[PDB]
Ligand SMILES: [Ca+2]
């Protein structure tokens with residue numbers, strides 16, 4: 001039996017599924033610790049930018065979990081992604097420890113723009129800016145990539161980098177009560193929020209796990225962007241971004257939630 005994690009229903013993905021919008025033909029790069037082979041995922045390819053870890057398999061668990069929120073297959077097992085037919089690419093920029101350099105991240109962004117990705121999902125935020133990171137976010141954007149980045153988990157009233165850059169769509173996290181998760185960074189530049197607490201998804205070892213963080217919120221938005229792209233193949237990254245913000249569910253404070261809660265079914269109708 002397939003279960004639908006609460007965040008998946010919270011964003012109204014199933015209603016878009018019923019209308020035929022599944023992410024078909026949309027290319028999504030997961031910039032994270034890698035993605036492990038799993039019965040509920042279909043990995044199309046990828047690259048590793050982590051010295052010493054040449055494989056795109058996941059040695060941490062984070063990248064596999066993020067991937068599942070985006071595109072766990074719609075079938076009789078496991079979970080269900082926002083965009084179950086999306087074309088998933090594993091872009092390993094974080095080593096098994098869960099950390100990486102500004103230069104491996106930057107190389108992963110360049111990779112996405114150079115290989116025609118439509119969406120790039122970045123889970124890690126840094127407290128300090130990086131001219132290298134900023135260049136990479138701009139380059140991917142000009143090559144038509146929608147860069148979706150986590151706001152960060154410090155609980156502070158300002159957002160991490162690269163989420164803070166103008167060309168990155170910054171995503172915070174809500175809890176099951178639609179309130180701001182305690183750790184979710186907010187403030188200037190926050191574009192939207194999605195579920196980030198108690199998120200069940202795919203995990204190495206052909207299993208499932210629940211994790212918390214802004215990196216769990218991010219894939220919900222990347223997945224929603226893939227449904228919009230499928231519905232509107234001629235739209236640009238900027239059109240998609242603006243349409244997601246415009247169809248988001250207002251939660252109140254723009255400081256805490258930006259445009260509000262992503263709504264996959266309102267964005268894709
Ligand atoms: Ca499944």
Ligand SMILES: [Ca+2]
Nearest residue numbers: 165168170189
């Ligand atoms: Ca931003």
